């Protein structure tokens, strides 16, 4: 969540 990336 929030960060994006590989799925945060």
User: What DSSP string describes 1-8?
Assistant: --S-TTT-
Beta-carbon contacts of residue 1 (< 8 Å; ≥ 6 apart): 8
Q: Which experiment gave this structure?
A: X-ray
Q: Are 8 and 1 in contact (CB under 8 A)?
A: yes
Q: Are 7 and 1 in contact (CB under 8 A)?
A: no
How far is the C-alpha of 2 from the C-alpha of 6, rounded, in Å? 11
Query: How is residue 8 written in tokens?
Result: 């945060």
Cβ 8 vs Cβ 2: under 8 Å: yes
> What residues have CB less than 8 Å from 6, skipping those under 6 apart?
none
C-alpha–C-alpha distance, residues 5 and 2, integer Å: 9
């Amino acid at each position: 969540p929030x960060v994006x990336x590989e799925x945060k």
